[PDB]
Design a binder for this molecule. Structure first.
Ligand SMILES: Nc1ncnc2c1ncn2[C@@H]1O[C@H](CSCC[C@H](N)C(=O)O)[C@@H](O)[C@H]1O
Length: 203
């Protein structure tokens, strides 16, 4: 069969997001909009998360949907994935982000390419990116590097114990991050975590 695309339509925060998913062309999981992405976008809407002027990076963006919403909300956004997904992401940026929006696309293979990015992002985003246990230390170190001292990380995941999500969120991440369960969507079984660099306590 020919490769083909499917469009999925969304309206978040009053903006149109028309997201192309490129199937049959060997993107694998990067082609799909997964469930925690929708949850995270709905949370940015419901909580009126402020992106205006903030320096934002998305990891494992897939289609780019979350980072696109951040850019529509006024963020200065860098949307990243492996090289295989970047053309898809770029298409979705071109389709959705207006002239005054800021959304660049770059490769960032976790724990390999993080040192060609600065260490000064205000917001670091990841939806459906906690699923490959052998990658966990690479992701951890990437998060550490990107998030500026007073920055915030948002991670949204469908909870699946057999892929290591509890290990990640309940063992690895809390060691050096102050971690909040920002929201649990019981129906979707998606948790949204907010993380900040762990602070030594003064007393
Ligand atoms: N080592 C790695 N470095 C960078 N991105 C990676 C990676 N391993 C997996 N990914 C990316 O992580 C994504 C997981 S699928 C989730 C895509 C999207 N954020 C969504 O929630 O819908 C894929 O696009 C995949 O290519």
């Amino acid at each position: 069969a020919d490769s083909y695309s499917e469009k999925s339509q969304f309206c978040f925060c009053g903006h149109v997001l028309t997201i192309t998913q490129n199937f049959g062309s060997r993107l694998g999981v990067a082609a799909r909009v997964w469930d925690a992405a929708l949850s995270l976008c709905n949370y940015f809407e419901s909580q009126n998360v402020d992106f205006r002027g903030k320096k934002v990076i998305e990891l494992g963006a897939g289609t780019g949907i979350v980072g696109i919403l951040a850019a529509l909300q006024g963020g200065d956004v860098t949307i990243t994935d492996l090289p295989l997904a970047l053309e898809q992401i770029q298409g979705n940026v071109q389709a959705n982000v207006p002239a005054g929006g800021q959304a660049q696309v770059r490769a960032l293979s976790w724990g390999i390419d993080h040192h060609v990015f600065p260490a000064n992002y205000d917001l670091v985003l990841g939806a459906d990116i906690v699923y490959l246990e052998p990658t966990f230390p690479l992701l951890l170190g990437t998060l550490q590097h990107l998030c500026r001292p007073h920055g915030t990380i948002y991670l949204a995941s469908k909870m699946r114990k057999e892929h290591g999500t509890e290990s990640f969120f309940q063992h690895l991440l809390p060691q050096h991050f102050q971690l909040e369960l920002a929201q649990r969507d019981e129906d979707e079984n998606v948790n949204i975590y907010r993380a900040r660099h762990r602070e030594p306590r003064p007393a």
